[PDB]
Design a protein around this ligand. Structure first.
Ligand SMILES: [Mg+2]
Ligand SMILES: [Zn+2]
Ligand SMILES: [Zn+2]
Lengths: 147, 133, 113, 263, 137, 506, 62, 49, 39, 32, 67
RNA sequence: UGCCUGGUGUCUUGGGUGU
């Protein structure tokens, strides 16, 4: 919900994903490089607030221009036995060894967009042509050619 | 066998930016005007100020693919606590008797200042440094 | 549409050998082993078992691509030992370790049942 | 040389500590339990009538995820390895579901308890959907109102979680070693002090904390591993552990046989 | 009610707290020291009501770079959800329905009147930010 | 629309994705696209057996064929032929076989601004439905994997295939004639991981070194001696990186007048392909001129330079996979000691602006020549506020530790800059619309929440807060105005630039 | 004229045992059968098919 | 919608003005040709009858 | 209408939760505003 | 009775071995 | 639409706990306490029951298309 | 012996995707 669009690059099975000490594997891994240039801090704040809410069984209130601060959410998260900033010690799926860097980890609301690759893939060797110009027709639905 | 040998007293130990790497500066006890600036691994060979180190430089450990050393074989490194291997990338034939040798042990740098007579034999491609304490 | 069948991760075609061994002539007494329909589960186990043998001087493996289920392993032993014998010794040793682990777990489970 | 010490034991989860094994062996065991232990799950759905508000393939996907008792699945054969034409009793289990709502008011819930085993291997304890108790209704499958009926026939086959996640016997395998970070395998992010900003591990009391004057030990390796195995009920925890060990042994034995037959 | 032309002649307070006269996390209010005293005539009901329907879905829109808010406003109209409850009896040219919609854990107060809780268009995924294997660059 | 540019046959289009495990000049092609497209191969006595096998396999099995063309020009369709096995191929016939591995294909992304937007790759058939690119070529194409699509064109002749493989090939396009510097370099997490991996205090154990060495395709089978032999054999990251660099490469760079002892590990010195000191980052393996890539291309040629990308990427990606890297909300937070400094700096700047306002209102303000009193006043206020934001950002940046992830990404040059740190941590700053502060849209004020004739910094679009701290409604609206101006400016200037370039080309 | 074209068939061997399909191509000894279960079409030898008839399933003697 | 079209375009109509506060959404606008010309009412706005 | 049991239970839960929220959130806001005032 | 009816000193005896304004209790019907 | 059979992240079976969860919420228990009483420890499982919206109760209100 | 099929509007407009 913060303009962070992307496409699936590869799918790993349950046993190939990194896991935390309590066995939680992520559903989805995004690159750290998406954050600094675009400055979507709201993404990180939403992840932290959602983590606290799912731990405590509440729904976070992310209304803008309120008195919510990151430190209050961090205190709540620390009181529940997690690192206050949301980091987690995470293990490597392939070898089982600990990762040297801790991983920001939590639930976030994602939405699936209408643009799927199977509705865009198109190839043409030969096919219908226009009557006037005898050049390939236009359109993926009509088995057309590329300009 | 050994191309240089001396005993150094550590003047300064600088951790600075890093956690596992320390800069140590030492001067030879038997001969001043010989300086040693060196990078070491703290976790394997920790040092403190005013320590005494026996530093030896050799061009070979004898008495191309690397292999884990068999327990049966013996080499020059059996007498020391910290052995590194590096390449000499600068041999500054400086002033009348000011010679500087720069050696890089895979990014961990060493500079050895001294007279020509002491460091004449250190004009090699690769050097082992053997440190005892 | 272009998604491969999931059983191709572990079901071996008839014409594809499970285990192809080719020597590596760049260094003495080295072989390259190509495992088909295998992944990190067997590879890491074998690699870390072989790394402890005093007569094995180089062992490594890599998975070329996550979308293909195979890995290739490089093994290189001392002059006395043929690498394939070292691989067999590693397999047998891990089997014995697993056997004693199973026996001990069964004993403990019966005690704490 | 390897040792096992059990902390807690239950029908559905066991918490144990492995020691004197390599990290690779423990991780391979975890991976094998997660994705290579065979179980039994519904793999074909023949929909004879479905007038509910859910799509046919919606209900098929829901059915495939229902755990079935897979105790004697070793005796069972793989579908592709059975020479029988079509499916026999030795490579498939047939379950049937029939649900209907009577009366012109109210809503009927369709539970997994309504799945009735029709045919299967003789005297093998496989195929029955897992129930927590004798009075547990089970997984909610669908809902029906008046004049809506669901009548399906499902076939269960043997497979592994590599092919599809519905054949996975485990839910989540907690895995952990070196609570006090004596090996320095991780470097702790911090703002002021790394010691008081990081929560203690749940096994921190099982190992002595390092002494203030202790030096780093470069000769140490991870030696004790704490892991918890949770199952979905299709297999007991001890069965999952033992069958993971057996599967790993079979894989290694197959490799050994290939090597010996190569010459 | 006031329109765009009557607003020229009124003095509005942002919050009811503005009607009366050292933390590193909380935000800083305007000092407004140019005027010795103020005589407000109106007060905003709630400042977060300056947003539209699509921009009322973003959580913490004030912690974001504004072009990202615009991009999300654009992309929220392409998220598959449940457009209506009677999708079975409708014959539309296209229709996309998500199997298992979930309501967001971090919601906004304006989502109550957009029925986003009852017809949500997304799911809560466990997201990890990491350079794992180089396939997410 | 029909003579200068026309629709063409033998082409494909689909979404692109990234693959770290592809060579620089390789593209991953789905199986369905490979089956649909074709290349007419002339039957000779070097390939008649293989072509007969392809004809037998038919148009549905890969590798296969779609048509057989006789000498007279008649086409035999293999879908509708009941006696495909009863076809004997004569020399000189053509078989329209399927697309296969190592076939050169032209690859293109729109808009094609320069000649590096069309380059010829080598086909590799892969499952799933997306084109796959090595990530180093995403720079010349100006492409990323958030939904972009790219075009593929198949040559249909021996002459055209030779032209593509000898002129437009990706390795030949590494150095551009526009600025005589490389257009492809190490990017994104490979850049971040080569900075992290080549730090002075990165040591690697034997078992990981063996795996890292086996990953290098060009490795010669000799393991280098470890930097530390006793008590424990340890290799440094610089050694494993030097493994990937071809021998005979010399590179020297001085950063900030550093000495040969490099106390800060800056600068660079590569002797015979071995790194002596210096952290490898954007200044070395980036796309700038005089770096490692430019040196290798000038010295060894396009083939070795193309292999260099693969070697470096594979080693660094394995190391970073087994090490890890992340970013969190805790990385945008500065301690109270720095927050009080930032607050003091901002308050001092606001006091200075207030004094300037008083001086201008009492006719005590000096006038810049060539500018009116109002223009000079506005320029001075804008300069003061920009200096305020820069000072606060500098304080925040100096606060950050070495383990801060944002600082690591900025230092590596992979993503972000100093202004991003300043705005996320310290102060968003002054919002400018059309090069000036926020105008007085209402009657002598910017918003109905301010009194008339108010020139204070917060009344004309100075966002005092940071993104972490959150923006007040007025700052939110002003920042939205500035962002809207940016979007409009982009969407308008693009058409003017396109027209200018078309006129220049014509 | 390929009497088994456009007829419901069931697979008895291989990796698709017990899946219902419809025969689409009947060139010879390699039948193209679209599967009802996923949305795909696969080749299959004639020996692996069970052609539906008025009385149960019949092997490749239809 | 603002029917100014594409011919004779200018940046001023497309801009977000001060007087838009509270009446139209500052964030929601299309991309490309219609940026700024297409507006969305704020969540409490109305139109006089 | 003859609502189902689950819907009736959900309605009761919603009423209870609405009342509890209206009480507790207001109390917390009143507690916070006085502290912000006295600072 | 409830926790409120407990004596304040006895409430002080209830020590964990306050609500926050931004944690709502979930609903299902919303409003409008 | 209807409570998922398995938790997406780990795979715990949560499809048999919807009715018990509603019964617990009916008795006045808080959502966190209700989720704890069902032995849902990991927050990946807790989000499945906590954020589920039950839409089948709205689809069932339409008159069935057959009889 | 009963024997198998390739052929696809145009013009406007509108909403979108990637730069
Ligand atoms: Mg893009
Ligand atoms: Zn059978
Ligand atoms: Zn779960």
């Amino acid at each position: 919900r913060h303009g962070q669009k992307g496409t699936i690059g590869v799918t790993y099975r349950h046993e190939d994903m990194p896991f935390s000490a309590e066995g939680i594997v992520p559903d989805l891994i995004i690159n750290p490089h998406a954050i600094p240039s675009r400055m979507t801090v709201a993404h990180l704040i939403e992840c932290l607030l959602s983590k606290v809410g799912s731990i405590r069984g509440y729904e976070g209130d992310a209304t803008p221009f309120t008195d919510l601060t990151v430190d209050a959410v961090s205190n709540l998260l620390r009181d529940n036995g997690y690192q206050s900033r949301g980091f987690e010690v995470m293990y490597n799926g392939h070898t089982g060894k600990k990762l040297m860097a801790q991983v920001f980890f939590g639930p976030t609301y994602y939405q699936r967009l209408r643009h799927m690759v199977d509705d865009k893939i198109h190839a043409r060797a030969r096919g219908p042509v226009q009557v006037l110009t005898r050049q390939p027709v236009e359109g993926r639905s009509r088995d057309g050619g590329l300009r | 066998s050994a191309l240089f040998d001396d005993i150094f007293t550590v003047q300064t130990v600088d951790n600075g930016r890093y956690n596992k790497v320390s800069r140590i500066i030492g001067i030879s006890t038997t001969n001043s005007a010989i300086k040693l600036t060196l990078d070491i691994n703290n976790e394997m060979f920790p040092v403190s100020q005013d320590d005494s180190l026996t530093v030896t430089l050799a061009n070979s450990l004898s008495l191309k693919s690397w292999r884990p050393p068999k327990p049966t074989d013996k080499s020059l490194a059996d007498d020391y606590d910290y052995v590194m291997f590096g390449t000499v990338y600068k041999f500054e034939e400086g002033d009348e008797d000011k010679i500087k040798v720069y050696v890089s042990f895979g990014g961990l740098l060493m500079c050895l200042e001294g007279g020509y007579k002491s460091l004449a034999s250190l004009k090699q491609d690769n050097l082992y440094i053997l440190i005892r304490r | 549409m272009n998604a491969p069948d999931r059983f191709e991760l572990f079901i071996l075609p008839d014409d594809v050998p499970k285990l192809k061994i080719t020597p590596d002539s760049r260094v003495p007494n080295c072989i390259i082993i190509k495992f088909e329909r295998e992944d990190h589960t067997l590879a890491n186990l074998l690699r870390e078992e072989l790394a402890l043998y005093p007569d094995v001087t180089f062992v490594a493996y890599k998975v070329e691509h996550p979308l293909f289920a195979n890995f290739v392993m490089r093994l290189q032993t001392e002059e006395g030992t043929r690498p394939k014998q070292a691989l067999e010794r590693a397999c047998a040793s891990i089997i014995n370790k697993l056997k004693t682990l199973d026996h001990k777990f069964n004993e403990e489970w019966n005690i704490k049942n | 040389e390897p040792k096992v010490n059990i902390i807690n034991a239950q029908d559905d989860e066991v918490e144990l500590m492995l020691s004197d094994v390599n990290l690779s062996l423990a991780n391979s065991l975890r991976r094998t339990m997660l994705a290579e232990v065979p179980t039994l799950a519904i793999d074909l759905v023949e929909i004879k009538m479905n007038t509910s508000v859910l799509a046919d393939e919606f209900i098929s996907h829901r059915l495939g995820l229902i755990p079935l008792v897979s105790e004697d699945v070793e005796e069972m054969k793989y579908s592709r390895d059975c020479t029988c034409e079509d499916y026999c009793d030795e490579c498939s289990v047939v379950l049937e579901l029939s649900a209907r709502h009577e009366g012109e008011e109210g809503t009927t819930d369709v539970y997994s308890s309504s799945l009735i085993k029709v045919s299967g291997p003789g005297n093998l304890n496989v195929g029955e959907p897992v129930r927590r108790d004798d009075y547990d209704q089970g997984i909610l499958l669908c809902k029906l109102r008046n004049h809506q009926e669901l009548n399906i026939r499902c076939i269960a086959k043997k497979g592994i979680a590599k092919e599809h996640a519905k054949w996975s016997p485990c839910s989540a395998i907690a895995f952990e070693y070196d609570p006090h970070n004596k090996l320095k395998h991780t470097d702790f992010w911090f703002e002021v002090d790394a010691k008081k900003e990081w929560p203690d591990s749940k096994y921190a009391t099982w190992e002595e904390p390092p002494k203030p004057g202790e030096v780093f030990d470069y000769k140490a390796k991870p030696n004790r591993f704490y892991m918890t195995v949770e199952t979905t009920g299709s297999l007991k925890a001890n069965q999952v552990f033992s069958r993971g060990i057996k599967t790993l042994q079979e894989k290694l034995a197959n490799v050994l046989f290939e090597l010996e037959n190569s010459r | 009610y006031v329109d765009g032309e009557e607003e020229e002649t009124i003095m509005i307070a942002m919050t009811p707290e503005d009607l009366q006269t050292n933390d590193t996390a909380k935000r800083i209010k305007p000092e407004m020291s140019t005027s010795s005293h103020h005589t407000f005539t109106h007060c905003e009901i709630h400042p977060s009501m300056i947003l539209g329907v699509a921009a009322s879905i973003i959580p913490f829109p004030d912690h974001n770079q504004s072009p990202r808010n615009t991009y999300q406003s654009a992309m929220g109209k392409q998220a598959m959800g449940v457009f209506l409850t009677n999708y079975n009896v409708r014959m539309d040219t296209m229709a996309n329905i998500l199997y298992y919609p979930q309501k967001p854990l971090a919601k906004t107060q304006a989502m109550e009147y957009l029925k986003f809780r009852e017809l949500p268009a997304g799911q809560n995924a466990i997201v990890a930010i990491a350079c794992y294997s180089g396939y997410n660059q | 629309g029909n003579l200068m540019g026309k629709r063409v046959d033998f082409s494909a289009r689909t979404v692109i994705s990234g693959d770290p495990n592809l060579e620089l000049d390789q593209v991953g092609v789905p199986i369905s696209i490979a089956k649909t497209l074709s290349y007419p191969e002339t039957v000779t006595q070097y390939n008649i057996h293989r072509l007969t096998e392809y004809v037998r396999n038919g148009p549905n099995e890969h590798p296969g064929a779609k048509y057989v063309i006789r000498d007279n020009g008649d086409r035999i369709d293999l879908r509708y032929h009941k006696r495909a096995g009863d076809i004997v191929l004569q020399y000189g016939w053509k078989v329209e076989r399927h697309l296969m591995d190592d076939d050169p294909v032209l690859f293109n992304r729109q808009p094609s601004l320069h000649k590096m937007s069309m380059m010829a790759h080598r086909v590799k058939v892969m499952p799933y439905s997306t084109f796959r690119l090595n990530l180093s070529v995403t720079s010349p194409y100006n492409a990323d994997f958030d939904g972009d699509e790219m075009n593929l064109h198949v040559p249909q002749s021996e002459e055209t295939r030779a032209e593509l493989s000898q002129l437009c090939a990706v390795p030949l396009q590494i150095v551009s004639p526009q600025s005589n510097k490389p257009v492809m370099g190490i990017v994104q997490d490979t850049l971040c991981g080569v900075r992290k991996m080549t730090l002075r205090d990165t040591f690697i154990e034997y078992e990981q070194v063996m795996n890292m060495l086996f990953w290098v395709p060009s490795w010669d089978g000799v393991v280098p001696q470890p930097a530390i032999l006793k008590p424990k054999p340890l290799w440094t990251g610089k050694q494993l990186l030097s493994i990937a660099i071809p021998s005979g490469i010399h590179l020297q760079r001085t950063d900030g007048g550093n000495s040969l002892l490099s106390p800060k590990d800056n600068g660079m010195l590569i002797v015979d392909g071995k790194v002596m000191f210096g952290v490898v980052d954007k200044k070395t393996v980036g796309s700038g001129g005089g770096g490692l890539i430019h040196t290798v291309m000038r010295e060894k040629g396009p083939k070795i330079c193309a292999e260099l990308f693969g070697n470096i990427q594979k080693v660094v990606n394995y190391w970073l996979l087994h090490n890890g890297f992340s970013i969190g909300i805790g990385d945008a937070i500065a301690d109270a000691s720095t927050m009080k400094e930032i607050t003091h700096a901002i308050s001092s700047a606001k006091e200075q602006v207030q004094e300037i306002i008083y001086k201008a209102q009492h006719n005590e303000l000096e006038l810049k020549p060539g500018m009116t009193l109002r223009e000079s006043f506005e320029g001075e206020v804008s300069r003061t506020l920009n200096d305020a934001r820069d000072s606060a950002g500098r304080s925040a940046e100096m606060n950050l530790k070495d383990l801060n992830n944002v600082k690591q990404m900025v230092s590596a040059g992979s993503k972000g800059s100093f202004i991003n740190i300043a705005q996320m941590s310290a102060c968003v700053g002054q919002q400018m619309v059309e090069g000036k502060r926020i105008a007085f849209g209402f009657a002598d004020r910017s918003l109905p929440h301010f009194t008339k004739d108010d020139f204070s910094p917060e009344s004309k679009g100075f966002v005092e807060n940071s993104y972490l701290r959150g923006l007040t409604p007025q700052e939110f609206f002003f920042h939205a105005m500035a962002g809207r101006e940016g979007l409009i400016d982009t969407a308008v200037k693009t058409a003017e630039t396109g027209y200018i370039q078309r006129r220049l080309v014509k | 004229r390929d009497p088994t074209l456009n007829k419901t068939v069931k697979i008895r061997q291989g990796g698709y045992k017990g899946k219902i399909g419809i025969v689409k191509e009947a060139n010879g000894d390699r039948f193209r059968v679209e599967l009802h279960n996923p949305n795909k079409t696969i080749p299959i030898p004639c020996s692996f098919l069970l052609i539906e008839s008025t009385h149960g399933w019949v092997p490749y003697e239809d | 919608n603002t029917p100014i079209g594409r011919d004779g375009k200018l940046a001023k109509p497309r801009q977000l003005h001060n007087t838009h506060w509270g009446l139209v959404c500052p964030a929601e606008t299309p991309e490309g040709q219609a940026c700024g010309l297409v507006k969305n009412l704020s969540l409490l706005s109305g139109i006089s009858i | 209408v003859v609502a189902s049991k689950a819907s009736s239970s959900m309605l009761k839960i919603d009423q209870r939760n609405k009342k509890l929220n209206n009480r507790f959130i207001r109390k917390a806001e009143m507690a916070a505003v006085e502290k912000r005032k006295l600072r | 009775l409830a926790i409120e009816n407990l004596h304040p000193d006895d409430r002080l005896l209830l020590v964990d071995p306050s609500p926050v304004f931004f944690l709502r209790r979930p609903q299902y019907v919303s409003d409008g | 639409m209807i409570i998922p059979v398995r938790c997406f992240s780990c795979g715990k079976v949560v499809g048999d706990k919807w009715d018990a969860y509603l019964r617990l919420l009916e008795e006045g228990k808080q959502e966190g306490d209700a989720l704890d009483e069902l032995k849902l420890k990991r927050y990946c499982c807790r989000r499945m029951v906590l954020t589920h919206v039950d839409l089948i109760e709205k689809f069932l209100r339409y008159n069935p298309l057959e009889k």
